[PDB]
Amino acid sequence: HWGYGKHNGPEHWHKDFPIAKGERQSPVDIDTHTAKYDPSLKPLSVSYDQATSLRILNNGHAFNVEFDDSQDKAVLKGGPLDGTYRLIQFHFHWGSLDGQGSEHTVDKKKYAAELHLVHWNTKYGDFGKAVQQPDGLAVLGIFLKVGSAKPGLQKVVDVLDSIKTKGKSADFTNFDPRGLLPESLDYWTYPGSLTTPPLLECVTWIVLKEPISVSSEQVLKFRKLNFNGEGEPEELMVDNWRPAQPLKNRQIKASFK
Ligand SMILES: CC(C)NC[C@@H](O)COc1ccc(C(=O)NCCc2ccc(S(N)(=O)=O)cc2)cc1
Ligand SMILES: CC(C)NC[C@@H](O)COc1ccc(C(=O)NCCc2ccc(S(N)(=O)=O)cc2)cc1
Ligand SMILES: [Zn+2]
Known part of the structure; x- marks a missing residue:
């Protein structure tokens, strides 16, 4: 099945998921001089104070921190969005070296990792319906650079030993995702897709301009996880x-000058 190796990686995905060559695929390079300021874009509204985290799971491709999205608890509104988008999960993509790992790039620059806070449009009733709609999802993307530690990330880092291999999960309640946000909410936005199979073209991407910094030790602990299951x-x-x-x-489009 699909993955990130030489024989099942991104250049192979189109054989099972032909939308991989579609008209609104993600990620993209953000050319900062070509993005256009749109003064009609509204400020983002990130309302995470009532967030209810549940669990953390190694799914064989990344690790997901999952949330209770059966009520309006942690929601994203405003910006380019119409309506209310509920936080379902967050996860990261990361590199083997500090100079690679992000999916989006900025003037061709790669960051060490990228955080994806995944939300779905409540007018579609459930997440599975939302992925079938061109405005079904909103993903808030945040770049990570290596520097000082991010204190709000450490509780994630410290549970990774318990979910080392594919299929392992652990309780993960009372986590506050506000501790992963940078100071500024200035952003770029464009219509795109899921960045993994099934690559559905259902995402309004909102990528923050300001990275967060994480320590060498924090990213090193990401790199100790396994794609494989226990005993493989x-x-x-x-x-x-x-x-x-x-x-x-x-x-x-850019929210800022
Ligand atoms: C349990 C509550 C609290 N939260 C979890 C909830 O948000 C997940 O909701 C879902 C998730 C999946 C479905 C569903 O219909 N699955 C069958 C079709 C389906 C399969 C795979 C995907 S994927 N790989 O893009 O995410 C999406 C839909 C329907 C609802
Ligand atoms: C009917 C069954 C099969 N569904 C139940 C069970 O399998 C769980 O269902 C699901 C299915 C999927 C999810 C879920 O989180 N899917 C994420 C799909 C997804 C989301 C975001 C990205 S990215 N890199 O663009 O931000 C990529 C893939 C959550 C629950
Ligand atoms: Zn992602």
């Missing part, structure tokens, strides 16, 4: 990122 040959979970895809007939 060990393959380190690193370089789980899709490279930039053609922009095609799309304009990236």
Whole structure:
């Protein structure tokens, strides 16, 4: 099945998921001089104070922190969005080396990792319906650079030993995702897709301009996870990122001058 290796990686995905060559695929390179400021874009509204985290899962491609999305608890509104989008899960993509790991790039620059806070449009009733709609999902993307530690990330880092291999999960209640946000909410936005199979073209991407900084030790602990299941040959979970895809007939808009 699909993955990130030489024989099942991003260049192979189109054989099972032909939309991989579609008209609104993600990620993309963000050319900062070509993005256009849109003064009609509204400020993002990130309302995470009532968030209810449940569990953390190694799914064989990344690790997901899952939330209770059966009521309006942690929601994203405003910006380019119409309506209310509920937080379902967050996860990361990261590299084997500090100079790679992000999916989006900025003037061709790669960051060490990228956080994806995944939300779905409540007008579609459930997440499975939302992925079938062109405005079904909103993913808030946040770049990570290596520098000082991010204190709000450490509780995630410290549970990773309990979910080393594919299929392992652990309780993960009372986690506050506000501790993963940078100071500024300035953003770029464009219509795109899921960056893993099934690659559905259902995402309004909102990518923050300001990265967060994490320590060497924090990212090193990401790199100790395994793609494989327990008792299978060990393959380190690193370089789980899709490279930039053609922009095609799309304009990236900026919320800031
Ligand atoms: C349990 C509550 C609290 N939260 C979890 C909830 O948000 C997940 O909701 C879902 C998730 C999946 C479905 C569903 O219909 N699955 C069958 C079709 C289906 C399969 C795979 C995907 S994927 N790989 O893009 O995410 C999406 C839909 C329907 C609802
Ligand atoms: C009917 C069954 C099969 N569904 C129940 C059970 O399998 C769980 O269902 C699901 C299915 C999927 C999810 C879920 O989180 N899917 C994420 C799909 C997804 C989301 C975001 C990205 S990215 N890199 O663009 O941000 C990529 C893939 C959550 C629950
Ligand atoms: Zn992702």
